[PDB]
Amino acid sequence: SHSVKIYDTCIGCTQCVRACPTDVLEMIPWDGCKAKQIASAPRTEDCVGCKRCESACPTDFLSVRVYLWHETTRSMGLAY
Amino acid sequence: ELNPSLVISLSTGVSLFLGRFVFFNFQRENVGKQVPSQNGISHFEAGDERAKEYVSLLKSNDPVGFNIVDVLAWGSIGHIVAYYILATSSNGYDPNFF
Amino acid sequence: ALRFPRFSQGLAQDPTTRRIWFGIATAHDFESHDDITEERLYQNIFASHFGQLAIIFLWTSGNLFHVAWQGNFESWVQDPLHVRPIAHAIWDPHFGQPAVEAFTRGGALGPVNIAYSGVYQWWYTIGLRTNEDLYTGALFLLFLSAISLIAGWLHLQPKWKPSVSWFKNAESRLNHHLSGLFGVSSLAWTGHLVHVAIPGSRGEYVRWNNFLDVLPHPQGLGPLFTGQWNLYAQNPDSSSHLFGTSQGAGTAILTLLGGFHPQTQSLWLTDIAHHHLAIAFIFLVAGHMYRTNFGIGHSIKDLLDAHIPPGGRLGRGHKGLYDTINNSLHFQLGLALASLGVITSLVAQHMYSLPAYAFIAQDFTTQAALYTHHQYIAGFIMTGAFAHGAIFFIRDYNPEQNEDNVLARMLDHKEAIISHLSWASLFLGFHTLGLYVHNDVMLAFGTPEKQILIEPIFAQWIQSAHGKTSYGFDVLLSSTSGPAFNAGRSIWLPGWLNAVNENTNSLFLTIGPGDFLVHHAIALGLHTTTLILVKGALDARGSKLMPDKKDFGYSFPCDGPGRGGTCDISAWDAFYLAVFWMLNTIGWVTFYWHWKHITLWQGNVSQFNESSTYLMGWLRDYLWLNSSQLINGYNPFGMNSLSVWAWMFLFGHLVWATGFMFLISWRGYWQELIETLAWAHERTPLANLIRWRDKPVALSIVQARLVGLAHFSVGYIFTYAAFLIASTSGKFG
Amino acid sequence: MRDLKTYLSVAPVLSTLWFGALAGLLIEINRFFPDALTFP
Amino acid sequence: NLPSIFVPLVGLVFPAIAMASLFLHVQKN
Amino acid sequence: VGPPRGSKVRILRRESYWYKGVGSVVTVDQDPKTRYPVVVRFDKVNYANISTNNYALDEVEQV
Amino acid sequence: DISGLTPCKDSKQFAKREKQQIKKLESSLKLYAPESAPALALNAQIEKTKRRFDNYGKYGLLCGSDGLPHLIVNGDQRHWGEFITPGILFLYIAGWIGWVGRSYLIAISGEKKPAMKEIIIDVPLASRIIFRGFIWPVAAYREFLNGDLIAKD
Amino acid sequence: ISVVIFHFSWKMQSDVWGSISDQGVVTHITGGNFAQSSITINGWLRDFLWAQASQVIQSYGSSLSAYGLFFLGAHFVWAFSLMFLFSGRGYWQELIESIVWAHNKLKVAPATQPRALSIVQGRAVGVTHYLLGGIATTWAFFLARIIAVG
Amino acid sequence: TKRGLLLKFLLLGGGATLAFVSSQATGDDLPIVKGPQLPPQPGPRGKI
Ligand code: CLA
Ligand code: CLA
Ligand code: CLA
Ligand code: CLA
Ligand code: CLA
Ligand SMILES: CC1=C(/C=C/C(C)=C/C=C/C(C)=C/C=C/C=C(C)/C=C/C=C(C)/C=C/C2=C(C)CCCC2(C)C)C(C)(C)CCC1
Ligand SMILES: CC1=C(/C=C/C(C)=C/C=C/C(C)=C/C=C/C=C(C)/C=C/C=C(C)/C=C/C2=C(C)CCCC2(C)C)C(C)(C)CCC1
Ligand SMILES: CCCCCCCCCCCCO[C@@H]1O[C@H](CO)[C@@H](O[C@H]2O[C@H](CO)[C@@H](O)[C@H](O)[C@H]2O)[C@H](O)[C@H]1O
């Protein structure tokens, strides 16, 4: 299972969550940004590692980071 | 034609005299500042039991502390110089500069 | 971990074929294994070194045994200029009768291979004469291999494991290696040369059963302990001496003659013995520098800490470097690899110009093979030195403990370094290629007198400083009344000058405009390869495109398609790119060496002098001209003994082409295709009864780069090895 | 008129005009001073 | 004498035994 | 709180694309619970074609 | 002479090359009428070759044992026309180009969208800048002393 | 297409094209060597690539000298394409980062920020140069051979 | 039908049979066993 982490440079525009192809990320309440919401990754066991969230990250540097880790049948996108 | 025994004895004597009366203070004050260490502690303190210094070997009753290791080092230098003299005098090398 | 690999639990749970491929590829990366400790790391490395030594001894024992069993050493030592050395026999059931006839060479009774490693000359020079000598050498080497394995097993046991603190005692290891491994070994070798090899060259047969009864010198250790060492140099071998016999044989054991032996065209054995004695003395003296147990010596930490310039231009100087070097195995490996790669090229450059083995110099194929072999090994080692230096920056570098020392300032001005290397490489490439194309265009238009031919005057002046008189410079050793020539007038200058001014050996070959361009091509290749490797090492921890690169490791595929694209961004990818440039550079230097020597051995250097100034000359007069015999190894009219090299030529071409597949096509195309094959197997009758246990997947992104690079390198090596050996063996120069 | 002058100031058009002038100059120099290996 | 026996052993039999053993090892668990 | 709006500021964040560069302060958030209140606009676009970023109060130097 | 080379006015290989080139050119002359245009064109090539070889003789070039001119670069005062003077002229032209480029890049830096003057060039501004490279060494030196050449970051 | 045109060239030069004398005897360009030599890869390497390239490599100093120059140029472009095909833009953007520093040090950094070529664009450049070099190599080799010997 | 016995028997017996057959091959079956029948060719420059 890959590792997905969120840092507090988040501005909470929810761009990563709607770019997830496997529903790994979601938005949770917060108080550290004007949007009062931060991203979370409670379902990294469904992560495939396509890094689509980082392509949607507006912050510099990235506020969502994907580290490729141990490979499972779910993480390799196998249907057979 | 050079006597090997005389040359070797004189060179060893001169080297020992220099090491005991001339260059002793510099050598001691320099070894005082150079002790091998790893990660801020000596090799023995790190756990290397084979790196312990031989306290019973370096001690001596010389008034300034001249020991057997100093004798070996300066005698080796004297022997090297003596054999250089003997090997450089026997040959008939002439650098023809003039 | 329940399955394979047992050292990586994460790989063990992989349900695909990737679990196998990666398990093989990470076996020796002990630092990344499960539950690894520093003590276990050091002990495992110590054990692995013994196994490597055992393999090295077994390989040499096998070579000696096969030479003694199936070779023609005894017939070769009686006609070294007319007997082809035999490596081993051939037993292939696939051979046809013409293949059996064509491969019966030397004086053998069946198919054999002709040795091009130069072991025959090396063993003949050092005193070995009979097959029994090789037989008893092989047994001793097998015994050594067994003892190395036994020691490797012993130091892995609980009561013989060495501690980490013992592995980190740099001073004692340096003292013992400088004085014992280098100094004492050289003294033993010159002892062997004095006792066995030198008598052997004068017809005296000295072995274990009689070496206590024969005096190496008539005076017998008298002059050594008296001081008149000159008595060991008074009567050297005459110029009419024949090697291996007593005709014109002297009694000297340590001389300073210089030059080559007139018959064998190699260095004098007495000069070699004197050289090794001097080197043994130097190393024995140097081995008494560091403090171990007796209160005298130096501390490397204090030496590095005290070398801080007071001006502050080097920052904190070398302070703290002892701990970074001592606690990082990658730093040590990089330093060792850089030094070893430098001296491998040094060996290659010195062995062809100053042959040390009897009757090697007029064995052209062996010389070419040895030079190419050692230069390619050096090229690979030098890339490894930078790869591990890059790994050190990621895994072992501690920025806080290296504050403002000479190692942090490199990361401070990495941009200035990389830009200047880029400028140098760009300048060299632009101007070398422009001059080559200009000369090509002049030759195409029928006006060879419009070429830009620059004389390599600096190197010609250096040659004249060594005593070469073909340019009329009259400088230093080329002069008669100077002090430099007067100093060595009666020691080594006569023989050295006679060898240098002899225009049929490889000692300071005459150079012209053709050498100037190829040397700058070599310089461009060197600069570009170092540019790639240094940029990879200095950007390993991060850059503007990937500020957190150190968080992903030395080898990762990418950072994805975002931020414009991040292909080949890891430090491993810089090494992968630089291997191609190393191969190209070494190919250039080997092409230069081979073409310059093959024309000199043929008696017409003017073919190289006029045709090396433009690239079509290289294509036509070197590659096309010298491939006529090789490609005719087998033809519709028959075959000859060159058929192996003809087959290997095309084999290397095929492997080189296969590597392009992995280097060009990438993973997704293959994964989407493998899915269809999985469906097809799952829907085929009488094949549904068979099921795979590991899910078939395409090769990984990093795995494919490694596989393609391996195929590229294997084809590159095999094609040129076949071409070089076949071209130098069809005509023998 | 203004727009056409703006278009003629675009990078490719200016580049081809400049390199054409340079090529013509070099060609004429080589036609009148051919085969120059040195600078007298 | 020896080559006619040794070449089939090293070229065919030993690789087959090693491949079988290694395959059974990697397919374990 | 924070640099005045419209001022010129040097960026001290190491991982930022405009590290050691100069940008212009647009707005500064006054909520004390906001971790990175200083909004900065730059002349050059980063690798993601973005010209604006938020920085903390200690990553910005008034110049 | 230098490095064992002989001057091309003395070397016989140079003259032999000149003779063989003319002979090669004269063999194709046999296939045309003596008054035809191809015959007039090959004659012009023959005169061009004769002039080339005579010039190479007069300029005082050194030729190797192959009959081809060889360049001397070390700095000999009688061979400055092969590397030193052409190199100085190249370094004057290249510095001119670089300085005109730098001045144009500086002149458009302070605008609203300065990337539009990099794809659509302000030709009058370039005309203003271009002729400042004639004195580029003086200005390049003078911004070195004051400190307007290097950005101190 | 390269294999098809090589087949056509060798077959026509070996079994169809040739000369005929006023006796009734036919002599082909390569003398019917296709049947016994085109069945091995070594045959293609030796009797077709090595044998028939002897024209384009000895065309210097003649009217066909432009084909050897194009031969070398096509080889160069084909080799040049492998830089684009074997690498990726992440290395090149990082390398450009250092050159941009050198330009900024001398105040010559352009406003149009230099970017490495896109992932798709690098593939296009590599394949275009590969195809151009490969096709031009055969163009020059075929034309030189068939003009000199045809 | 004993898979443990069958694997060992097949591998070992097949290896022994292969070695035995290779050791019993004659010169008619294998050219490598027949050996050379022609005088050897000389080297490029007189080497044997
Ligand atoms: C005098 C005592 C002594 C001696 C002889 C050695 C010898 C050795 N130690 Mg060692 N060691 C010592 C004391 C000593 N050690 C002490 C006191 C410590 C503790 C502080 C250690 C700690 C230690 C460690 C931790 C390791 C070693 C290792 C090794 C081996 C290095 C590999 C090798 O064979 O290189 C051979 C090197 C040479 C022959 C010299 C270099 C030759 C140059 C490069 C080439 C030039 C020669 C010539 C031109 C080429 C020949 C041409 C022709 C003959 C082919 C070597 C056998 C390593 C090893 O492999 O262990 C298994 C290792 O990992 N040692
Ligand atoms: C003294 C020399 C030395 C030592 C001790 C090491 C030790 C190490 N290196 Mg290293 N290296 C060296 C030299 C050395 N290297 C050199 C010279 C190079 C440049 C070529 C490299 C390049 C290099 C890279 C790029 C990497 C290492 C890595 C490593 C570590 C793990 C190695 C591993 O997993 O092996 C696994 C090795 C293999 C499975 C070998 C693959 C097979 C190769 C391609 C040979 C194929 C030959 C082919 C089949 C021939 C076909 C013949 C034909 C007729 C069929 C380990 C600490 C890795 C690491 O962990 O770094 C952090 C890593 O990424 N090294
Ligand atoms: C023959 C193939 C080839 C060639 C010519 C090059 C050339 C170059 N590589 Mg390279 N490379 C190659 C294959 C090749 N590579 C391969 C296969 C790999 C493995 C993937 C690499 C990997 C690699 C790396 C990793 C690096 C290079 C670098 C370089 C540059 C080094 C500087 C130099 O030599 O300046 C001389 C420049 C040239 C010779 C380029 C040709 C210029 C032409 C001839 C002039 C223009 C002609 C004409 C006016 C154009 C008209 C055409 C069109 C407009 C109609 C240079 C551009 C380094 C770099 O970028 O340094 C700056 C670098 O870091 N290369
Ligand atoms: C070192 C490796 C090696 C060795 C020693 C051989 C040896 C042989 N190969 Mg071979 N081969 C190899 C590698 C090897 N191959 C590889 C890698 C390939 C792939 C490219 C091939 C492809 C190949 C082909 C395509 C053919 C051969 C054939 C042959 C045989 C030719 C002799 C003959 O004419 O008698 C012919 C003798 C027979 C046909 C009778 C053989 C009866 C045997 C001895 C019975 C014993 C089998 C034994 C029970 C099974 C043991 C298996 C083991 C796992 C335990 C000979 C036995 C030819 C052949 O006929 O062999 C079948 C043949 O057509 N080989
Ligand atoms: C204003 C123009 C200009 C100036 C002053 C410089 C200056 C410099 N460049 Mg550079 N460069 C330029 C344009 C320029 N470049 C362009 C357009 C490119 C893209 C092709 C590059 C690509 C480039 C690379 C890849 C490298 C440099 C490097 C360098 C430095 C070393 C010199 C060198 O290698 O030159 C070589 C210069 C070139 C190869 C490109 C020259 C292109 C033409 C001649 C410039 C034309 C400018 C413009 C069109 C004219 C303005 C017209 C205006 C009046 C309207 C130096 C600071 C090197 C470096 O950083 O090391 C310190 C280095 O590695 N440059
Ligand atoms: C007690 C006393 C005393 C005395 C002392 C003494 C007398 C001492 C001595 C000492 C000594 C007496 C020492 C010695 C030493 C020596 C040595 C240490 C040596 C060494 C050697 C060597 C090292 C060698 C080397 C070599 C070789 C081996 C070979 C040849 C060459 C050479 C030389 C290199 C007195 C009176 C003062 C006072 C008090 C009491
Ligand atoms: C990356 C990295 C690394 C690596 C690096 C490298 C790899 C380097 C290389 C380097 C090199 C590779 C160097 C080289 C050098 C060389 C030299 C330094 C030489 C010298 C020489 C000399 C000095 C000589 C002189 C002389 C004499 C003595 C005699 C003759 C004459 C003359 C004068 C010439 C490390 C690991 C560290 C770590 C960090 C990172
Ligand atoms: C620290 C260890 C001890 C260091 C000091 C060791 C002794 C130093 C040299 C003392 C004098 C040695 O002097 C030298 O001795 C050797 C050894 O027998 C003699 O050697 C003599 O006997 C030996 C065998 O014993 C013969 O091989 C030799 O042919 C013969 O000459 C020399 O003839 C003599 O010149």
Residue of H100, H101, H113 best to disrupt the F interface, most CBs of F under 10 A:
H113
H124 by DSSP, 3-state: which? helix
Whole-number Cα distances in Å, C373 to C117, C207, C348, C360, C651:
10, 33, 9, 16, 19
What does the angle CA G73 – CA G79 – CA G85 come to, to the nearest 5 degrees? 80
Q: Which residues contact A58 (CB under 8 A, 6 or more apart)?
A: A11, A13, A15, F48, F50
Handedness of CA C522, C525, C527, C529 (dihedral sign): negative
CA distance C277 to C676: 71
Q: How would you class C509 by CB atoms within 10 Å of its CB: exposed for 0-12, middle for 13-18, buried for 19 or more? A: middle
CA distance C174 to C179: 8
* Nearest-CA distance D9 → chain G (Å): 5
Q: Which of I7, I15, I23 sits opposite E4 (nearest CB)?
A: I23
Residue of H nearest to C564 (CA): H118
Q: Which atom in ligand 6 lies closest to the alpha carbon of residue B83? A: 33
Residue of A2, A66, A71 best to disrupt the C interface, most CBs of C under 10 A:
A71
**Between chains, do C563 and F17 touch, taking CB under 8 Å as contact?**
no
In this complex, whether G and E touch, counting 3 or more CB pairs under 8 angstroms, is: no
Nearest Cα residue to C429 out of I14, G134, H80: H80
Structure tokens at B38: 């790893």
Q: Which residues contact C659 (CB under 8 A, 6 or more apart)?
A: C707, C708, C709, C710, C711, C712, C714, C715
Which amino acid residue places its CA nearest to atom 18 of ligand 5?
Answer: H114
How many helices (H) and strands (E) are present in chain G, helices listed first?
Answer: 6, 3
Residue C581, phi then psi, degrees to nearest 5: -65, -35
CA distance B88 to C12: 71
> Are H48 and H10 contacting, i.e. CB atoms less than 8 angstroms apart?
yes
Whole-number Cα distances in Å, B64 to B32, B59, B70:
15, 11, 12
CA distance G130 to G151: 23
* Nearest-CA distance I31 → chain E (Å): 13
Q: Is H98 on the interface with F (CB under 8 A)?
A: no
Nearest Cα residue to C385 out of C333, C329, C324: C333
Q: Is F50 on the interface with H (CB under 8 A)?
A: no
> Are G73 and C520 contacting, i.e. CB atoms less than 8 angstroms apart?
no
Residue C639, phi then psi, degrees to nearest 5: -140, 165
Q: Which residue has the tokens 């230093």?
A: C476
Structure tokens at H113: 């920020």
CA distance A71 to A48: 9
CA distance H98 to C425: 14
In this complex, whether G and C touch, counting 3 or more CB pairs under 8 angstroms, is: yes
Q: Which residue has the tokens 């080898």?
A: C555
Nearest Cα residue to C129 out of C83, C89, C76: C76
Q: Which atom in ligand 2 lies closest to the alpha carbon of residue C25? A: 39
Whats the size of chain I, residue-wise?
Answer: 48
Residues from chain A contacting residue C675 (CB–CB below 8 Å): 79-80
How are beta strands F22-28 and C112-114 bridged, if at all?
Answer: unpaired
Nearest Cα residue to H90 out of C330, C701, C527, C393: C701
What is the distance in A from the centroid of ligand 6 to the CA of A64? Answer: 73
Beta partners for residue G54, in sequence order: none
* Nearest-CA distance F15 → chain H (Å): 14
In this complex, whether D and I touch, counting 3 or more CB pairs under 8 angstroms, is: no
SS (H, E, C) C538-551: HCCCCCCCCCCHHH
The one-letter amino acid at A46: D
Residue H28, phi then psi, degrees to nearest 5: -85, 170
**Between chains, do C298 and B34 touch, taking CB under 8 Å as contact?**
yes
What is the distance in A from the centroid of ligand 1 to the CA of C509? Answer: 37
In this complex, whether H and A touch, counting 3 or more CB pairs under 8 angstroms, is: no
Chain center to CA of F39: 5
**Between chains, do E29 and C3 touch, taking CB under 8 Å as contact?**
yes
> Which subunits have 3 or more CB–CB pairs within 8 Å of chain H?
C, F, G
Q: Where are the alpha helices (DSSP H) in chain H?
A: 2-11, 34-37, 41-43, 51-52, 65-86, 89-105, 119-148
Q: Where are the alpha helices (DSSP H) in C665-695?
A: 667-682
Q: Which residues contact C615 (CB under 8 A, 6 or more apart)?
A: C436, C437, C440, H72
**Between chains, do G52 and C470 touch, taking CB under 8 Å as contact?**
no
For the Cβ of G121 lying below 6 angstroms from any atom of ligand 5, the answer is yes
Q: Which residues contact C419 (CB under 8 A, 6 or more apart)?
A: H98, H99, H101, H102
Q: Which residues contact C645 (CB under 8 A, 6 or more apart)?
A: C630, C633, C722, C723, C725, C726, C729
Over its C-alpha atoms, chain H yields an Rg (Å, rounded) of 23
Residues from chain C contacting residue H69 (CB–CB below 8 Å): 440-441, 444
Whole-number Cα distances in Å, C600 to C364, C503, I45:
11, 10, 16
The one-letter amino acid at G84: I
CA distance C583 to C379: 7
Name the helix (H) or strand (E) containing I39.
none
Q: Which residue has the tokens 């080589």?
A: D30
Residue of H nearest to C615 (CA): H72
Chain center to CA of C733: 24
> Are C475 and G92 contacting, i.e. CB atoms less than 8 angstroms apart?
no
**Between chains, do I22 and E8 touch, taking CB under 8 Å as contact?**
yes
CA distance C87 to C66: 7
CA distance G48 to G43: 9
Residue of C nearest to I39 (CA): C101
**Between chains, do I45 and C100 touch, taking CB under 8 Å as contact?**
no
Chain C with chain F: Cβ pairs closer than 8 A = 14
* Residue C185 is labelled as binding a ligand: no
Q: Hey, what long-range contacts does C140-144 have (CB within 8 A, 24 or more apart)?
A: C141/C57, C141/C58, C141/C60, C141/C61, C141/C64, C142/C57, C142/C58, C142/C61, C144/C57
For the Cβ of C45 lying below 6 angstroms from any atom of ligand 2, the answer is no
Residue C327, phi then psi, degrees to nearest 5: -90, -5
Whats the size of chain F, residue-wise?
Answer: 63
CA distance C65 to C280: 31
Pocket test for ligand 4, best of I8, I17, I26, I30 (most atoms within 8 A of CB): I17
Q: How would you class C669 by CB atoms within 10 Å of its CB: exposed for 0-12, middle for 13-18, buried for 19 or more? A: exposed
Q: DSSP letters along C287-307, please?
A: TT-B-SSSS-SB-HHHHHHH-
**Between chains, do C650 and H42 touch, taking CB under 8 Å as contact?**
yes
Q: Is C302 on the interface with B (CB under 8 A)?
A: yes
HSE on the CB side for C456, CA within 13 Å?
Answer: 19
Nearest Cα residue to C632 out of H13, H43, H32, H57: H43
CA distance G103 to C20: 61
* Nearest-CA distance A8 → chain F (Å): 8
For the Cβ of C28 lying below 6 angstroms from any atom of ligand 2, the answer is yes
**Between chains, do E5 and I14 touch, taking CB under 8 Å as contact?**
no
Q: Is F9 left (phi over 0), alpha (psi -120 to 50) or beta?
A: beta
Residue of C nearest to G57 (CA): C449
Structure tokens at C511: 């150079």
Q: Is F44 on the interface with H (CB under 8 A)?
A: yes
Q: Which residues contact G84 (CB under 8 A, 6 or more apart)?
A: G75
> Are G153 and F20 contacting, i.e. CB atoms less than 8 angstroms apart?
yes
Q: Which resolution, in Å, applies to this structure?
A: 2.4
What is the distance in A from the centroid of ligand 2 to the CA of C64? Answer: 28
What does the angle CA C665 – CA C668 – CA C672 come to, to the nearest 5 degrees? 115
Which amino acid residue places its CA nearest to atom 17 of ligand 6?
Answer: B75
Structure tokens at C104: 């019966």
For the Cβ of E12 lying below 6 angstroms from any atom of ligand 4, the answer is yes
* Nearest-CA distance A25 → chain F (Å): 21
CA distance I41 to C90: 18
HSE on the CB side for C209, CA within 13 Å?
Answer: 2
> Are C327 and B37 contacting, i.e. CB atoms less than 8 angstroms apart?
no
Q: Which atom in ligand 7 lies closest to the alpha carbon of residue C333? A: 36
CA distance C201 to H93: 63
Residue C145, phi then psi, degrees to nearest 5: -60, -45
Q: Which residues contact A27 (CB under 8 A, 6 or more apart)?
A: A12, A14, A17, A37, A38, A39, A40
| CA-CA-CA-CA dihedral for F31, F32, F36, F42, to nearest 10 | 50
CA distance C134 to C119: 11
Whole-number Cα distances in Å, B73 to B21, B65, G27:
15, 15, 87
For the Cβ of C8 lying below 6 angstroms from any atom of ligand 2, the answer is no
Q: How would you class C410 by CB atoms within 10 Å of its CB: exposed for 0-12, middle for 13-18, buried for 19 or more? A: middle
